[PDB]
Amino acid sequence: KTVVVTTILESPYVMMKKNHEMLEGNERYEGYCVDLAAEIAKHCGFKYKLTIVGDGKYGARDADTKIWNGMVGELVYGKADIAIAPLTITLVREEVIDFSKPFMSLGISIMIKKGTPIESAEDLSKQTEIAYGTLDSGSTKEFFRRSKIAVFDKMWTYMRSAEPSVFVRTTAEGVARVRKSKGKYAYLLESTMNEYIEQRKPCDTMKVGGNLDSKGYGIATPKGSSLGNAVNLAVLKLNEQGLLDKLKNKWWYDKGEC
């Protein structure tokens, strides 16, 4: 009867509280998705347990084995009842799991060190003095790898061939690289995270230009799950009440350092 929620550590969606080892259960964690899970459970009247996805992935199908990894996999194979995380609704994932309507919108976007003479994706695409890259795996890299749009295809060809490697292993490494490269590195990541980092010390990064795509994060459940229909209605209610808007203001701008 206790709902098994899979999620992932990713600021400010889910983080461990600084004093977590003194605490127990769901109270160990805080963040946008922590609050969102509590609001959903409250409205739906169920008990739940926050668990962290074992492989630290969002969800992709291995070409060789055809096995789904990440939170998507935990749902497909019945290891969890629901995923609450900044998990993008995509065509390939929609075919294997159910998604709520989006609880938050986003797009791929450009992060620069303040002063970097870049304003758009097209700008980056037409030069090489300012190196630019993204995560060495995951959805943004796949977006570029697969894009048939001229500018993005040019950007991909550059990134894959650029030396030294313009890719990084983690978002922290990416942001650290922006900050240390003296304007000579720009970073591609989701607008939500870009905006969050813009409001934190040392206040030396900025989101520039329009988003490169448009998509949403959804709550995910195994295909045909009865819990899925209910949680989707809950997300629609919370949105219509303005609670989702308050939640973003809480975690993005209220706790704003810049």
Residues in binding site for L-glutamate: 86, 88, 93, 139-140, 190
Question: Which of 171, 205, 221, 232 touches ligand 4ZK (CB under 6 A)?
Answer: 171
Instruction: Name beta bridge partners: 61.
Output: 68
What span, in angstroms and rounded, lies between the C-alpha atoms of 166 and 121?
16
**Which residues, 59 to 98, sit near a copy of itself by CB under 8 A?**
89-91, 94-95
**Which residues, 201 to 240, sit near a copy of itself by CB under 8 A?**
213-216, 218, 232-233, 236-237, 239-240
Q: Which does 105 bind (CB under 5 to 8 A by kind): ligand 4ZK, a copy of itself, none?
A: a copy of itself
* Residue 229 backbone dihedrals phi, psi, to 5 degrees: -55, -45
Whole-number minimum distance, CB 51 to ligand 4ZK, in Å?
18
> Which helix H or strand E contains 3, and what residues bound it?
strand 3-7
Whole-number minimum distance, CB 105 to a copy of itself, in Å?
6
The residues, ordered by sequence, that sit 6+ positions from 169 with a Cβ below 8 Å of its Cβ are: 135, 136
What span, in angstroms and rounded, lies between the C-alpha atoms of 237 and 258?
32
Whole-number minimum distance, CB 234 to a copy of itself, in Å?
9
What's 166-200 look like in SS3? CCECCHHHHHHHHHHCCCCEEEEEEHHHHHHHHCC
**What is the contact surface with a copy of itself in residues (CB under 8 A)?**
89-91, 94-95, 99, 101-102, 105, 148-149, 213-216, 218, 232-233, 236-237, 239-242, 244-245
